[PDB]
Design a protein around this motif. Structure first.
Motif, short mmCIF file in Angstrom:
data_model
loop_
_atom_site.label_atom_id
_atom_site.label_comp_id
_atom_site.label_asym_id
_atom_site.label_seq_id
_atom_site.Cartn_x
_atom_site.Cartn_y
_atom_site.Cartn_z
N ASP A 127 0.82 -1.21 -0.13
CA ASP A 127 0.05 0.02 0.01
C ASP A 127 0.82 1.36 -0.02
O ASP A 127 0.28 2.50 0.19
CB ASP A 127 -0.75 -0.03 1.21
CG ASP A 127 0.02 0.18 2.54
OD1 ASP A 127 0.87 -0.54 2.70
OD2 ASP A 127 -0.71 1.19 3.40
N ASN A 128 2.20 1.19 -0.32
CA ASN A 128 2.98 2.20 -0.48
C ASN A 128 3.50 2.50 -1.96
O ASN A 128 4.44 3.22 -2.13
CB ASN A 128 4.31 2.24 0.53
CG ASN A 128 4.07 1.90 1.90
OD1 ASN A 128 3.96 3.23 2.61
ND2 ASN A 128 4.00 0.80 2.60
N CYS A 129 2.50 2.08 -2.69
CA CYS A 129 2.66 2.48 -4.11
C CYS A 129 3.91 1.80 -4.64
O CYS A 129 4.70 2.43 -5.57
CB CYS A 129 2.73 3.90 -4.41
SG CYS A 129 2.35 4.47 -6.02
N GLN A 130 4.24 0.63 -4.27
CA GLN A 130 5.53 0.03 -4.72
C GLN A 130 5.17 -1.47 -4.67
O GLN A 130 4.15 -2.07 -4.07
CB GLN A 130 6.61 0.34 -3.55
CG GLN A 130 6.41 -0.48 -2.54
CD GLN A 130 7.35 -0.07 -1.12
OE1 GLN A 130 8.11 -0.97 -0.36
NE2 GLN A 130 7.93 1.23 -1.24
N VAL A 131 6.01 -2.12 -5.60
CA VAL A 131 6.01 -3.57 -5.68
C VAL A 131 7.33 -4.27 -5.90
O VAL A 131 7.97 -3.65 -6.76
CB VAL A 131 5.02 -4.06 -6.92
CG1 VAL A 131 5.25 -3.40 -8.09
CG2 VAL A 131 5.04 -5.32 -6.88
N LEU B 28 5.74 4.01 -7.84
CA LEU B 28 5.15 4.94 -8.65
C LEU B 28 4.85 6.23 -7.87
O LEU B 28 4.35 7.05 -8.46
CB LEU B 28 3.79 4.66 -9.04
CG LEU B 28 3.51 3.06 -9.96
CD1 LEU B 28 2.19 2.62 -10.02
CD2 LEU B 28 4.18 3.26 -11.43
N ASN B 29 5.50 6.48 -6.64
CA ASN B 29 5.49 7.51 -5.91
C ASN B 29 5.97 8.60 -6.40
O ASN B 29 5.88 9.83 -6.29
CB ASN B 29 6.22 7.08 -4.50
CG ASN B 29 5.36 6.32 -3.49
OD1 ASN B 29 4.35 6.49 -3.03
ND2 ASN B 29 5.84 5.22 -3.60
N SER B 30 7.16 8.42 -7.53
CA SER B 30 7.59 9.33 -8.39
C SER B 30 6.84 9.92 -9.36
O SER B 30 7.10 10.86 -10.05
CB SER B 30 8.87 8.64 -9.16
OG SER B 30 9.70 7.62 -8.17
N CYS C 95 -1.81 7.03 -6.48
CA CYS C 95 -1.40 6.81 -5.06
C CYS C 95 -1.37 8.21 -4.54
O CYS C 95 -0.78 7.94 -3.28
CB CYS C 95 -0.38 5.68 -5.02
SG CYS C 95 1.33 6.39 -5.92
N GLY C 96 -1.75 9.12 -4.98
CA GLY C 96 -1.44 10.52 -4.32
C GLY C 96 -2.70 11.16 -4.78
O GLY C 96 -3.17 11.03 -5.95
N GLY C 97 -2.71 12.55 -4.02
CA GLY C 97 -3.77 13.41 -4.61
C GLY C 97 -3.37 14.12 -5.66
O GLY C 97 -2.16 14.56 -5.80
N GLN D 17 -2.22 0.46 -4.04
CA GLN D 17 -2.05 -1.00 -4.19
C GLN D 17 -1.30 -1.46 -5.40
O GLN D 17 -2.14 -1.41 -6.55
CB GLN D 17 -3.55 -1.55 -4.13
CG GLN D 17 -4.28 -1.61 -2.89
CD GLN D 17 -3.69 -2.37 -1.72
OE1 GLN D 17 -4.21 -3.49 -1.84
NE2 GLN D 17 -2.61 -2.04 -1.06
N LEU D 18 -0.19 -1.13 -5.42
CA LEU D 18 0.69 -1.67 -6.58
C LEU D 18 1.05 -3.22 -6.79
O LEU D 18 1.42 -3.79 -5.83
CB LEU D 18 1.82 -0.88 -6.66
CG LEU D 18 2.87 -0.99 -7.89
CD1 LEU D 18 2.02 -0.76 -9.09
CD2 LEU D 18 4.06 0.21 -7.80
#
Length: 147
Positions: free
Chosen positions: A7-11, A22-24, A46-48, A73-74
């Motif tokens: 749930d941290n936008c990562q896999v 994908l937080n980038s 995954c962000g506003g 959810q990546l």
């Protein structure tokens, strides 16, 4: 083994151990995806975004239809990073599910970009917004087991 749906936008790739991010792609600037009919569908990753409500991951611009609620959810599935923005707005179109967005992140040889989210297909069975996202981050420079 299998994708690491965090749930941290990562896999983390079970093949390489290469963590994907994908937080980038998190900017409030927001994203857009021209919809086949007569509008587009805005996206937030995954962000506003200001183009879609915070809490809304994907939303139509036409009549402002949350097509998939905020998720980080990546996953990494079929060599593609995938975000499944589910439990969005109610879909009364064909089936009575809710809108859900499946942004398939497809490796692009670019350098840390998102390029453009492309609307590939809509699923009227499960009201699933299929997005094609060509992102370099979905690409592995990391060599797998069988390279």
């Amino acid at each position: 083994m299998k994708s690491n749906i965090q749930d941290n936008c990562q896999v983390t790739n079970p093949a390489t151990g290469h963590l994907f991010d994908l937080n980038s792609l998190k900017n409030d600037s927001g994203y857009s995806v021209a919809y086949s009919e007569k509008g587009l569908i805005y996206i937030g990753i995954c962000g506003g975004t200001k183009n879609c409500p915070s809490g809304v991951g994907v939303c139509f611009g036409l009549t402002k239809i949350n097509a998939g609620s905020w998720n980080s959810q990546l996953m990494y599935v079929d060599q593609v990073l995938q975000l499944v923005y589910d439990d969005g707005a109610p879909c009364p179109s064909k089936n009575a599910l809710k809108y859900k967005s499946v942004i398939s992140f497809v490796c692009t040889h670019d350098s840390g970009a998102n390029n453009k989210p492309v609307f590939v297909s809509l699923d009227k069975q499960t009201c699933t917004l299929y997005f094609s996202w060509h992102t370099p981050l979905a690409c592995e420079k990391e060599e797998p087991r069988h390279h």
